[PDB]
Structures are given as C-alpha cells and as structure tokens.
From a paper:
SNARE (soluble N-ethylmaleimide-sensitive factor (NSF) attachment protein receptor) proteins drive membrane fusion at different cell compartments as their core domains zipper into a parallel four-helix bundle. After fusion, these bundles are disassembled by the AAA+ (ATPase associated with diverse cellular activities) protein Sec18/NSF and its adaptor Sec17/α-SNAP to make them available for subsequent rounds of membrane fusion. The disassembly requires multiple ATP hydrolysis events in the presence of Mg2+; as few as six ATP hydrolysis events are sufficient. The side-loading and side-release mechanism explains how Sec18/NSF can disassemble SNAREs with constrained topologies.
We chose the Sso1–Sec9–Snc1/Snc2 complex (referred to as the ySNARE complex) because each component of this complex crosslinked with high confidence to the D2 domain of Sec18 (Snc1 is highly homologous to Snc2). We prepared the y20S complex in a nonhydrolyzing condition and, after single-particle cryo-EM data collection and processing, we obtained 381,591 high-quality particles that yielded eight three-dimensional (3D) classes into which models were built. In the structures of all eight classes, Sso1 is threaded through the D1 pore of Sec18. A characteristic phenylalanine side-chain density in Sso1 is present at the same position relative to Sec18 in all classes, allowing for reliable indexing of Sso1. The nucleotide states and the arrangements of D1 around the substrate were also the same among all eight classes, with the ADP-engaged E protomer forming the top of a spiral staircase of tyrosine residues. Protomers D, B and C were all ATP bound and formed the middle of the staircase. The bottom protomer, A, formed the base of the staircase. Protomer F, with no apparent density for nucleotide in D1, was not associated with Sso1. Given that this charge distribution is replicated between each pair of D2 subdomains around the D2 surface, it is unsurprising that the Habc domain adopts multiple corresponding rotational states over the eight classes, presumably because of the flexible linker that follows it.
Author numbering:
A (entry chain L): 433 to 455, 457 to 473, 475 to 499, 589 to 650
B (entry chain K): 213 to 257
C (entry chain H): 1 to 108, 115 to 186, 197 to 289
D (entry chain G): 1 to 150, 154 to 190, 195 to 292
E (entry chain I): 1 to 189, 198 to 292
F (entry chain J): 27 to 86
Amino acid sequence: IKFTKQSSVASTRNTLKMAQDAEAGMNTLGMLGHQSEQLNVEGNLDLMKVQNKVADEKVAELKKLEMELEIDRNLDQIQQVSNRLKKMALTTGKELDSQQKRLNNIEESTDDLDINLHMNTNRLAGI
Amino acid sequence: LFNDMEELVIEQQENVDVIDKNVEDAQLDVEQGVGHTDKAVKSAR
Amino acid sequence: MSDPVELLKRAEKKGVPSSGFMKLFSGSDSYKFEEAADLCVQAATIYRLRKELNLAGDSFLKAADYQKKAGNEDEAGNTYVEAYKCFKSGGNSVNAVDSLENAIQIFTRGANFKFELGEILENDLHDYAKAIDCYELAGEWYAQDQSVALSNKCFIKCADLKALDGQYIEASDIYSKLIKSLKDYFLKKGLCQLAATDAVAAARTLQEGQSEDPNFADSRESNFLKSLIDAVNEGDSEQLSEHCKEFDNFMRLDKWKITILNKIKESIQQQED
Amino acid sequence: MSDPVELLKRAEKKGVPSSGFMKLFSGSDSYKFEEAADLCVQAATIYRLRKELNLAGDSFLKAADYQKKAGNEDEAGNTYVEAYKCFKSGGNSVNAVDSLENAIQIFTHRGQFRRGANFKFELGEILENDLHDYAKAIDCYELAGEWYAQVALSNKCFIKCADLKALDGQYIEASDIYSKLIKSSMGQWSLKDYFLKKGLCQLAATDAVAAARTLQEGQSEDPNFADSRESNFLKSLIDAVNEGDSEQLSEHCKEFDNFMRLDKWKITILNKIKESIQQQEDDLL
Amino acid sequence: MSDPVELLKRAEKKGVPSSGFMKLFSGSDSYKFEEAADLCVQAATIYRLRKELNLAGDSFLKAADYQKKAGNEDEAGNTYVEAYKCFKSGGNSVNAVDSLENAIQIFTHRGQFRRGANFKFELGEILENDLHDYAKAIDCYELAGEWYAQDQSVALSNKCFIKCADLKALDGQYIEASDIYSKLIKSSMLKDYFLKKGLCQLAATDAVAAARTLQEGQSEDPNFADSRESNFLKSLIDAVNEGDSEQLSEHCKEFDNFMRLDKWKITILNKIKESIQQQEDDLL
Amino acid sequence: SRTAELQAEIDDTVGIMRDNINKVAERGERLTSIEDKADNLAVSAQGFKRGANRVRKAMW
C-alpha cells in the first residue's frame, strides 16, 4: 500500500506536469491571433477588386480609342489546468472554423483577381 | 494532439508570411499598372 | 549569363544625369534611371543565383536608388526590401538595417518592416534602445490600423525590452495599455513596479486584476504576485527566493522574470544593508 | 473541336525561326512563338480533357520551351507547372521531375525562391517515394529549407532532410541539422523530438559523449524534454551502450514501444546502434 | 433607375450580328456584343437589387452568351458564376446547374482546373441535395477530386473522394466505393476510412476482403489496432462469417452506445444484416 | 467522484481537439492552395503593370 501510494503520487506529478505542458495551446492561439490579423490580406484583396474595376473601364476605353494529501493537491491542480485546457480546445475549434471560412473567401477572391489581371493583360497586349 | 496541432501551426506560419507578402506585392503592382493605364488614357485623348 | 560586373558598369554609364547643353535635347532622365535600375536588378539576380548575397544586396540598393531618381518610389521600396533580404541572408545586418529604414520611409508595410528592423536591432546588433523605438512606433502604426493582436505583440516586445533596460515605470505603463496573456501582463506590470521600489502600485495592480478578471484572481500568477509584495513589504529577501523557487517548480520562470526578480531581491538586500 | 495533333503540327510549322533573307523582312519571332505556345496549350487542354495526361504534359513542355524562346519566362514556368501536373497525375515521375527542375530554375532566376523552394520540396518528395533518389532529394530538402530561411517550411524541410541524412549513414550532418532545428524551434514539442533524434544520431556515430551532452542540453535547456519520457529513454540508451550490453538495450526498445510505438527512422538508428554493439562484439575477439 | 426590361430590349437590338451587305462596312461585331452584355449586366444588377433573383440570373445568362460571342470567354465564365449565384439564392436549382456547367466548361478550357473543381464540387452538392440526381453528383465529385489530385490539393481531393465513395456505397456500388476508400487511405497514411472500406466489402458479401482490410489497417498504423472501429469491424466480420444476424445487431447497438452511428453506417449495416438474413433463409 | 469527473472532462477535451486536428488539416491545405494563388496573383499583377506600361509608351 505504501508502494502503491508512491506510484500514485509519481503519476499525479507526471499528470500535472503534462497538463501544464499542453497548456502550447497558448503559443498556438497567440500565433493564431497573429495570423488572423495577417489574413485580415483581405484588405489588400478588396483594394485590388476596386482597382481592377478601374482597370476594366480604362482599358475598355483604351481599346475603343503526506502522500494522500499530495495526491489530493496534485489532482486539484490537474483539475484546474484541465478545465482551462477544455476551454482552449473549444475556442481553438471556433477560431479554426472562422478562419476556415475566411480563407475560403480569400481563396476565391484571389483567383478571381488573378483571372481579371490575365484578362486585362491580354487585352492590353493587342493595343 | 497539442504537439500535432502546434507543429502544423508552426508550418502554417510561412504560408501566412508568403500570402501577406505576395498579395502585398500584387497590390502595389496593380496600383502601378492602373496608374499606367490612367496615363495611357490621358495620352490617347 | 551576362557578367554582373558589366551590367553594373552599363548601369552607371546610363545613370549619369544629362548636364549642360545636352539637357536641352535629351528627354526626361527618368527613362535612363529606369534602364540603369533594370541593369542593376539583373546584376543583383545574377549575384544572387551565385549565392554572392551581399553583392546582390548592393546591386539592389543601386537599383532602388536609380528607381528613386526615376520617381518610381514604390519600386524603390520593393527593391530595398529585396536588398534587405539579400543582406539578412548574407549576415550583413548593417546594410539590412539601412535597407529597411529606407523602405519604411518610402512606405510611410512600414509596421511589418519596422518590427523586423526591431528584431534585427535586438538580436543581431544588440542596439536595444532603437529596437525599443521600433517596437513602440510600429505598434502605434498597428494601433492606428486597428490590428489589436499585432500591436499587442509589439507592445509586449517594447515593454519587455524597456523593463530589461531599467525603464520599469514605462514598461508598466505599456503593460497597462496591453491589459486594457492577460494574467501574464498583470504579473509583469507588478514586477516592474517592484523593481521601481513601488510596492503599493504592485498591490493595486494585483487588486485590479483580482477584481476585474476572475481568471487572474484565482491564478498562480496572482498568488505569486501577492507573495512577492508581502516579501517586499517585509524586507525578507530569502522569503522572496523561496517563493521564486516554488513558482519556478510549478511554472518555469523565463529569463526575463528571473532578471527582474533578481533586481527586486537586490533592492531588498540593499535596503537591509 | 479541333484535332490536337493538327494543332501541334501547326505549332511546329509556326515554331521555325526566320532564317536568311526572310529574316530581313519578317518581324520579331516572338509572335510566332506566342502563336505556337497558345496552340500547343489548346491541343494540350484537348488531350487533358481526354484524360491523356502524358500527351498533355508533353505539349505543355513544348509550349513552355516555345514561351522561353519568346521571352515570357513566367508563362513558361506556369506551363511547366502544368506539364508537371499532368506528368505526376499520369504516373510519369521522371518527366514531372524534369518539369519541376525547369520550373524551379525559372523561378530562382526571377527572384522567386519561395516557389522554387516549395517545388524543390515537391521534387524531393517525388524523388524519395517514386524514384528513391535519396541523395538528390536530401539536397533538394536542404536547399528548400535554406531558401525558406532566406521559419516553418524550413523547419519541416530540415526535419525531413535530417531524416534522410541520418537514415543514409550520415549521422554527424543529420545531428548538426537537428541542432539547427533545436536552435530554430527553441522558445517545443518538435524540440522534444529533436533532442532525442540528435542523441540517437550521435550515438549511431559511436560518440557516446555526444549523446550524453545532447541529453544534458535537452535536460537543462528544455524543461519539457528534461521531464519527457524521451529523455529517460535517451538516458537509458546511453547507459545501455555505455555498458555495451545489447540485452538491456533491447529491453529499453521494447519498453519504449509499449507506450509510444516506435517509428521506422528510430528503428533503423537503434538497429544500427545494436549492430554497432555487435561490431563491438567482433571488436572484442 | 433605368427599367431593366428596357435595358434587355436594347441589348437584344444591339446583339444582332451584322448580316449581308452591312457586314462589309460594319466593324467587328465583338463591340456590339460587349455593349449588349454590359446592358444585360445592368439589367441583372437592377433585378438583384429588386430581389427578383431568377430574372437577374437570366439577364446574367444573356450577358454571358453575348460575352462568349464577343470572344471574352473569361468574362462569360464569371458572369455564369453570377447567374448561378442569382439562381441558387432564388431556389432555381436547374438553371443553377446549367450555369455551373457552362462556367466549368469555360474554366477547364482555359486551364483553370482549380476554379473548375471548386464549382464542379458545388455542382455535385446541388445535384445531391436539391435535385437528388445522385449519379451525376457521384460523377461530379469523382471528376473534380481528380482535378484536385492533379493540383496536389490532397485534403480537397480527400473530401471529394469521401463524398464520391459515400454516394457510391449508398447507391449499391460497394466495390468501387471500397476502391475509393483505398485511395483515401493511401493518400492519408483514416480510422473512419478503414471502417467504411470494410463495411462496403461486407455489403458486397466479401468477408475475406473485409478481414484483409482489417489486418492491413491493424498493421500499417498502430492507432487502428487499439481503436473501437477496428474491434467493431472485426466483430462484424465474425458475425458475418457465423451467419448470425442478431449478434451483428447487438454489436451495432454497443457501437452506437459508444460512438453514434451516422445515417450512412446505419444503411450499410442494415444491408449487411439483410444479406445475412437472406443467407439464413436460403439454408432453411 | 471527482477523479471520474476529471477523467470525463479530459476525454471531452480530447474529443474537441481531435476535431481541432482535423480542422487545422483543412486549414493547412487551404493555406497551401492560397499560397499558390497569391504566387499566381503576384505574377499576373507584375505582368499587368508591364503591359500597361508598354501600352503607355506605345501610345506616347
């Protein structure tokens, strides 16, 4: 029984430790905020849409022109961390969802712009 | 799971850098091009 | 492949402005500068394929300068960023700094590159003061652009460098701005206050975080901060050390916290002496 | 819908440069190459719609060469990417590799090291899996990561590059790349793997002190790896090689497998270490 | 605001090609078609502002046709995508399908496989969900997943072949769905894919192929040896080999209790049970 | 009863975050494809600039 309690204390130590370690969820989320701001790319893409409208019109005109207690405390701390980790799984899922829709929009917008630029380049080539 | 997620997100950092840079270069090149077509329209008139 | 040296030589020969009587018969000198810049870009590309990166950067600097004389400042900024890349990859941090300064001047993108400039100043040149300036200014540029997360990264870097540089009060103020990661910001604010022999402001920062943010109220960080304030009020440096070891055991103290905590301990021991 | 073979014949007829007297009266050959490139692209779109991917890729290569002759290098690179697309989808790895090489050369020639590095990584992947060209794939991964450094794709590429180098017998250079990975990723999980892998590489190089200092660095620098079962495993490996007892080494491998299944890379390295102990057993008699 | 009917009428008048003697004096008819297309786009804009979405779609279709006559095929593809958006928001699935087919033809002709694949997938979704033309949806997902597999877009192609294989398996094409799941497995080297492959094989009454699939999954990646899905596939194989449907139903209930069986799995397991029961009845 | 609840909560976080692994899969491929597009876009922007400049010179 003393050996079993020692093994339990060792494993709760390891458990709290790994829980802290996962609590990486921060470097992931902080950077996801960083890249979220970077994808908010969208500003440049909107500006290109306006400016390709302008290019269309201009170029169209161009063409026209003791041991128990430690177990208890370690479990306490493991619970605290694990609760917080659950929050992080939930929020990371949410943020990935929102960024996924945003990236899909960025995707289609960029290719549309690419096509419009190839169009305008080809129609400039003949003038 | 955290390891797999963080490492993959480490990978995605370059994609985000490259996308920001590429779209930024494109925007400036389009701006210059539109300016050139503007001057061209001014001349043909 | 053309010899990049000969391409450069042709670039300088074309890059001479029309002087005197010839200026009356020569068109705008812009075209000559554009052609010289094109030659310089070609030479830079050829050096850069050879992994003669610093020479490629120098050729890009020449190209950007010709582009500036042509009136094509946007191209000059892009080419300065190219020269920068060549220098940074070439280990020539000084010319990299010069390139970003010029580029950020044309752009004022300026915030992205001002941050990268701050990183070079911090890590490669150890010019901490002007790196602090970079982080502050570029975080302000983001704050104007409503990019909260980036601006927060920027003010974190600025505040950390300021606190390491002995400007504890200013770092605490930047941490107040960052607050307005949150648990960490509260901790750091108090710590700077403690390095300024300001125990009462640390107590208020603790109270503010405890009342306003429940996650900080029950956190290990708030408990650590109260324990440190209690030690500082008690003039008990070994108690401070004991609390530091406990917190290190449960939450590894990074190098920044260790430095600031050592400063706080030294201020206690100095009062004891 | 036009016959693609007729379109290719028309492109070939039009693709002859002006020669002799006619060159003095005929305009720039760029127009003829442009026409040939457009027409080969059309013939290839036709082949490609018929699922005849290899013919579409060959036509893409022809159009890309004609565009190179026309001076449009970016369009030549795009057509090379198309040639690559249809070759890789057609199972022709060698022609896909040739397209990737031409594409990457165009791209680095245009200052686009980024795309060159992405396609260098694709090229090394194709080489490793389909053609088993390990040395040139190692070089491809190294160059891709270097240009990426010029953070993450380089981190990924360096992981794979170190993997191929260590599996290929080059332990010291693979360990050096693992140190580079350690330094780049410091400030975590990838680090937890890196320290172990570095130690394994150095222990395959019979430098037991090198594995010991690698583990000590992981323990002192990274608190995670200090506490990680990878560190205890690396300590146990170091001990077992120090005593030169292959049996305890075997038990340590089994123990490691029981909770985290071991990867082919680590099995090859640890088999090489065990076989190094067997070479030591020959070194005894 | 201009009357969109008036704009369409003017567009139709402008869209008449120059015939006869007038063709010798009239410039390229391209410009007339461009102007008619612009007028049709204006009418479509006005209709979309008036939430008369189907009419806006029709006006965009006319604009795209005029653009095709002008030689501006890329404009036509974009305008077909606009006509599509108007029709889909208007609940007119058929005209939406036609718009995507035209647009995808234009895009594939111009080498824009990525866009063609995006829209071919959306076409598959319309065929599956609003029109229930499952066969053409299967064809769409297959072709467009191939187009992505060309572009190296592995995760897209995997979503695509998931949809294709699911519709094939629901349509009784068990062997082909299992082959597509093999492709998915190979491209992803996943637990769900191994399970579904085996289930298709059981629905084809080929318990030997299911057992080989189970062994492959168990051997090639360890997460399978210890998963509930591998145990469930083994249990189903054991029930099928024993010809005892009640045990299969018990295993399905247990697995439902720990991981909810979605509709597709329920269908496949029902047909597997039906095959067992048919064999039992044939032996009496 | 606390230990069982903690085990259940850990299992649930595992479930949420296995889904997160799949989501970042879809995001990573998304980012690769978008990189290819903005690469293409930068090319097309440079080409459009150069063509517009050439038309400006031709007309001048």
